[PDB]
Amino acid sequence: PYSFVNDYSVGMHPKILDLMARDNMTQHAGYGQDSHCAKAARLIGELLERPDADVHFISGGTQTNLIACSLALRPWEAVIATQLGHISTHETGAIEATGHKVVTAPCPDGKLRVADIESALHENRSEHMVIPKLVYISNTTEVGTQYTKQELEDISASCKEHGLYLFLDGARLASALSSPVNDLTLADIARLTDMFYIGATKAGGMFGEALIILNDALKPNARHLIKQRGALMAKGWLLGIQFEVLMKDNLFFELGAHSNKMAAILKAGLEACGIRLAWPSASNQLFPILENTMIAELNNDFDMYTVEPLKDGTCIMRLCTSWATEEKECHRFVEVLKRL
Amino acid sequence: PYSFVNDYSVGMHPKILDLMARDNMTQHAGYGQDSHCAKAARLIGELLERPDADVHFISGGTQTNLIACSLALRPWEAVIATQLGHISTHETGAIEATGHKVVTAPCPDGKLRVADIESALHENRSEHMVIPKLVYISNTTEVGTQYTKQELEDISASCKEHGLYLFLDGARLASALSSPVNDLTLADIARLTDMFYIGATKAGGMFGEALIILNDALKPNARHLIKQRGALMAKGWLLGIQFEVLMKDNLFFELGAHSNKMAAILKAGLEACGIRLAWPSASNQLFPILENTMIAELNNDFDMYTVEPLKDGTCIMRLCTSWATEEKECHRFVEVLKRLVA
Amino acid sequence: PYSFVNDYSVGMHPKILDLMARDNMTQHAGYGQDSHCAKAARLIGELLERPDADVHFISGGTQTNLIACSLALRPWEAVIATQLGHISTHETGAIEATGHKVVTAPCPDGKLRVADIESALHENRSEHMVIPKLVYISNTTEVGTQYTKQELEDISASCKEHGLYLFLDGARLASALSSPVNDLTLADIARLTDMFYIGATKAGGMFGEALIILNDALKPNARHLIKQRGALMAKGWLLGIQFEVLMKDNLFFELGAHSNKMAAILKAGLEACGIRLAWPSASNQLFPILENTMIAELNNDFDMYTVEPLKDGTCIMRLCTSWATEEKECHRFVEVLKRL
Amino acid sequence: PYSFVNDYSVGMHPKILDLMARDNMTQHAGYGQDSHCAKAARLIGELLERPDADVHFISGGTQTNLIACSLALRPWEAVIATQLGHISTHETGAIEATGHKVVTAPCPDGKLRVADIESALHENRSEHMVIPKLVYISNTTEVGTQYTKQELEDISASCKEHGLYLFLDGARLASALSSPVNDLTLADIARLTDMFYIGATKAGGMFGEALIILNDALKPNARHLIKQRGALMAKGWLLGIQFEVLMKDNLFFELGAHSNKMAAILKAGLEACGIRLAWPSASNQLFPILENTMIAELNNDFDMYTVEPLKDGTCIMRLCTSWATEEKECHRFVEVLKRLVA
């Protein structure tokens, strides 16, 4: 039963496994103070064209989001996000556990606009309400859409005018920056945000996120906070290794390109069969609307994620591809689908 | 300029002030372990017909809401409320500062319904989402509407079905229970909720909320939590005195009836002038939609709250009466309004 | 049964009651935005000779301490205090509930010294430990001792050299600044600290603390935090009234002088009977060591606080006087004691 | 320069790496809902003789400690620990960041005793103080000593008497239970604690702690809390693989025995050279008091941790061995030390 459930069902790219195997039995200092982390961080600084930035390696996405917000926010400050943002839905109150409110905006396509930021600022006023101070966006978003350069430039400009930090969640940044509708580079993101992260977990690594802190005010003692939240991994050179391999020779983007090419095969198949997607997609996620009878038959050969059942005898399903997805399985899916 | 801004603009009812005056210079034990809090707690127990309820005296409403959520919720649990609820809007994220999420429901008239609770429970599933465990309602609500006994009984039964606690914010319980459209008593509220509070701040007292804990699982060591959040007032007998006067001889409900009656004079003046209200009201709050040019002239004689500017050259205002509101000011508002409209 | 248990057993000074009674039925704006708070704050600024300071009126001491620490501390920062400090013992984890550690120093006489600050800084180092950032002291302290000007000057200088905020808890500041061994004024405290509070609850008011914020970095949006913690009292002009009466015409200090004169009568009586105090005192608190048999007999006519029973058939008791203490009761205590 | 700095300087035991290699490219369900975590959990259940225990796989020790305190404590409750405990010193206030106080006891040899627990319960009374509810111990401790079965049974019985939970930090449980002075098994620890964890990070694994929950009141929705604190690893099968290899064929205890044996060579060299240890040790940590001039020469060949400079021109150092420590480096340390002393 081949799985399209998520982009973290396989361990790691063979070249990461190889470096981990060949490096075994060497002695390293702990907590990210080692040679691997230093090399990965240097490589990342060069790709961003911001070698002044601080890079911290952290094991997971929820970990990284709650650390970022806790670094950027005073007790009476809040974070703005879409209602579909990962921090609004699927971190079991992680941000609120740090003591801060997520102010949500209803953006059906999963993308924040300047008008939602402005409206969130208009609604929260006086000493009786939280002060929005951080804006959270995801690229790609939690429904597979993504930002253009002009969109991120508009958001960034608005944040600077109102004194807000801008944080970009890059769980699926490899997919985003490899998509054919994309016109952002890593250097653009580093130019336009106060902080962001590059996800390795969903892009070839067994774990790891690279939290990049660009705004000088957010930098001090970040490692203390990482430690306090349980995120300062003792054998931290193993996180560095993920990035030392992925960020070398364009691998990160080549794997991203593959995941998007796989999803494009599924999408061409879906569209040839008259099946509609709930959101537009040029990334590694698809949200087909399939009849329940068809789903029960597809379940015999593929695992999918159920997003939301609907009253008219259909569900929104999610298909997810990754760096590890077998092209042959994508063509099989389409062939099985055509015959249903 | 006479103020209709809110229901906490005047200090306290003269009878409360009288007791504080006569009592002054008498020595008392601290932190609510005194005689006045004991008497207040007993009167409350008898009005609710639950002498087994734990009664805790606390100074403010935000204080009370944050303590109640903290008592009822584990770290991964959450409170359900309307988008207009006090804890969702006007507490500077006090509940979030205790570590908990407020899950909201869009209810345009400020009242939770069973369908909203159910829909909150459906949307929040798996180990990747919070677990809703407490339901928060306000009577009256923050937009001046209020719950009937049947509405509260349906909410209460849905909560028992799904294993949720129900907590009622009674900041404006005096106005609610003295209203002509009301069919709830304090006994009913005690029967149907695990926890609620009776507000004195807005009903005659200088401060004071009485937190009533009814469900036995919420009771133990509540005083430790109150202390921790800075809410265990040293001279606690002074909170007690507020309720020892208000809960005696139906004074609480008589002050509420006065506040509702003053609002009824304002409401009659507004309705004779063709001015519409943004929400229905039989309580102490009114939300007239008025012309901006009208507002600028009213402003010379009266102070009102500005709720929501609209595109079409008008504005939703709030008028609020209290136990202290003067009838002659109410008639005067109506009369200035008729001169303006004509 | 006359009570020497604490300094908050009587409601308020008659002149406060009178102003509250005569002001009743006037309309006021809420949340401290009124005329009474403005006048009290102006009076306090003049007494401190720092009219640039921000003054916020808050109802209680625990409330004020947890707000002060939450204003001064980032998530990985901690507060230094003696083991006998109120925030280390008797706030049921209030500071820790805001997310911060209290680092304690063993100071038997209840006073912090420069060497304890320095030692607390030496012990907490690296990204694996909290960063001490705030120093908490009390005047008078929780065992009735108090700071001299030279002591506070030494502490203040050390805090400035190490980049620490200095916060003084003035629950019993009236007693301290009225004592015959005192050489500090309010103006000295305002000169030497980043923040402190003047307690009214124990000095004539029914409640109220005046949180003074001197350090410009601590000021922004303090009212948001006060609101969030439940401390922004709706009818806040009633707190202002306490201070409008107390800080006028030296009343605060005259009441403080009376509480110290009362304790001096008790102390002269104790010392004439050969009874030792557990700490030196020139303030409104005494800590006599009395035999258990003598305590049972004194309990017939006076209520006292039991501090710590001891194995040799004695207890450390606390006697507390205030602005409201009846001189006749103090002479009675001494007369009863002499005859035991 | 060969390092004796700590017991997490090398990646992982070759057998763990072998399984990860062979398993790579196989698809798995996320968040610990996979086959490897199921097998690891079952092996653990059988070693403890408690197949009813909930086993949760978590990446790090600080992570595990903060989750365990959060599971066991209400907001006004606190954890008792020694002053040398990991949660009192070296977690950047992680427990305090969850909202709870750590109440400490001065125990110079790193071991809690019953008198300490009792004295913590006496000092903390009334609604004005925290309530101690959880006891935290470490085996081995942070200074290399360890608990006997009788010590643990007395601690455990005092906890049952006073209604406290007992939690054991097993970061260095492999070294402790493979030591010659030890008389505890994993079955014993499971019998006498409500919760503990077995550390793989320092005993062969690249990461991994197995949190075992035994008391039924602590169990429900633990996975929601793990998620909330960012500790629910997406590719959770990789944590599982660590224990599926370590808990098979006594490998966990064999690696611990190797680590203790290497330390015994170092300890013998130190004792033949007249050098004293700051605490007694039969585990993988040693705390020699050495001359500063000695240290500067040793530094050219070896890396050690500096614990505490002393006034008299000497210094307490820490030496730490692990499953990966080379015997030839141990003999070499002893030999360089004898040349230096002579």
**CA-based nearest residue to C305, from C4, C2, C23, C1:** C4
A-B C-beta contacts closer than 8 Å = 47
Specify whether the CB–CB gap between D80 and D123 falls below 8 A: no
Specify whether the CB–CB gap between D240 and D32 falls below 8 A: yes
Residue A54, classed as helix, strand or coil, is strand
Expressed as residue numbers, the domain containing D58 is: 1-250
CB contact under 8 A, D201 and A231: no
DSSP D73-139: --TTEEEEEETTSHHHHSSTTHHHHTT-EEEEE--TTS---HHHHHHHHHHS-STTS-EEEEEEEES
DSSP one-letter code for D247: T
Which chains have at least 3 CB atom pairs separated by less than 8 Å from chain C? A, B, D
The nearest CA of chain D is from the CA of A38 a distance in Å of 17
What's the total number of domains in chain A?
2
The dihedral formed by the CA atoms of D155, D159, D165 and D166, expressed in degrees to the nearest 10: 0
Give the separation between CA C114 and CA A54, rounded to whole angstroms: 35
- Searching chain B, which residue's CA lies closest to the CA of residue D77? B224
Residues of B in contact with D125 (CB under 8 A): none
Query: Position of tokens 């991203």?
Result: A256
- Searching chain D, which residue's CA lies closest to the CA of residue A66? D230
Q: Is B18 on the interface with C (CB under 8 A)?
A: no
- Do B281 and B139 belong to one domain? no
Amino acid at B221: N
Helix (H) or strand (E) holding D163: none
Residue B277, classed as helix, strand or coil, is strand
| Candidate from A26, A92, A238 with C-beta closest to D206 | A238
CB contact under 8 A, D225 and B76: yes
Sequence-distant (6+) residues with CB within 8 A of A105 are A80, A81, A82, A83, A112, A116, A117, A119, A120
| Candidate from C64, C228, C234 with C-beta closest to B93 | C228
φ, ψ of residue D2 in degrees (nearest 5): -75, 135
Indicate the residue among A250, A276, A298 that finishes a domain.
A250
- Do D260 and D198 belong to one domain? no
CB contact under 8 A, C89 and D127: no
- Do D201 and D328 belong to one domain? no
Give the separation between CA A305 and CA C263, rounded to whole angstroms: 75
Q: Structure solved using which method?
A: X-ray
Give the separation between CA B316 and CA B275, rounded to whole angstroms: 11
Q: Is B75 on the interface with C (CB under 8 A)?
A: no
- Do D199 and D269 belong to one domain? no
Give the separation between CA C272 and CA A69, rounded to whole angstroms: 63
- Do D235 and D146 belong to one domain? yes
Residue B293, classed as helix, strand or coil, is helix
- Asked whether the bond before B140 is cis by omega within 30 degrees of 0, the reply is yes
Tokens of A108: 């059906």
Count H helices and E strands in chain B, helices first: 14, 13
- Do A205 and A303 belong to one domain? no
Residues of D in contact with B32 (CB under 8 A): none
Count H helices and E strands in chain D, helices first: 14, 13
Hey, how many other C-beta atoms are within 10 angstroms of the C-beta on C34? 21
Sequence-distant (6+) residues with CB within 8 A of B264 are none
Burial profile D40-59: b = 16 or more Cβ within 10 angstroms, e = fewer: bbebbbebbebeebbbbbbb
- Do A215 and A295 belong to one domain? no
Q: Is B279 on the interface with D (CB under 8 A)?
A: no
Indicate the residue among A250, A285, A313 that finishes a domain.
A250
- Asked whether the bond before A140 is cis by omega within 30 degrees of 0, the reply is yes
Indicate the residue among A227, A250, A273 that finishes a domain.
A250
Residues of C in contact with B37 (CB under 8 A): none
| Residues belonging to chain C | 340
Q: Entry resolution in angstroms?
A: 2.1
- Do D241 and D130 belong to one domain? yes
Q: How far is CA C285 from CA C59, C146, C260, D120, in A?
A: 23, 11, 8, 26
Alpha-carbon torsion (C261, C263, C265, C271), positive or negative: negative
Strands (E), chain A: 2-3, 54-58, 77-82, 102-105, 131-138, 165-170, 195-199, 209-213, 285-286, 289-291, 302-303, 305-310, 314-320
Which chains have at least 3 CB atom pairs separated by less than 8 Å from chain B? A, C, D
- Do B48 and B118 belong to one domain? yes
- Do D138 and D264 belong to one domain? no
Task: Find the CATH number of the domain harbouring A242.
Answer: 3.40.640.10
Cα distance from N-terminal residue to C-terminal residue, chain D: 22
CB contact under 8 A, C90 and D127: no
- Do A208 and A178 belong to one domain? yes
Tokens of C166: 């200095």
Residues of A in contact with D6 (CB under 8 A): 30
Give the separation between CA C272 and CA C280, rounded to whole angstroms: 16
Tokens of C259: 């509480």
Tokens of A65: 């989001």
**CA-based nearest residue to D173, from D152, D145, D198:** D198
Give the separation between CA C119 and CA C132, rounded to whole angstroms: 11
Task: Find the CATH number of the domain harbouring C264.
Answer: 3.90.1150.10
Give the separation between CA D9 and CA C147, rounded to whole angstroms: 50
Specify whether the CB–CB gap between A288 and A337 falls below 8 A: no
- Do A205 and A182 belong to one domain? yes
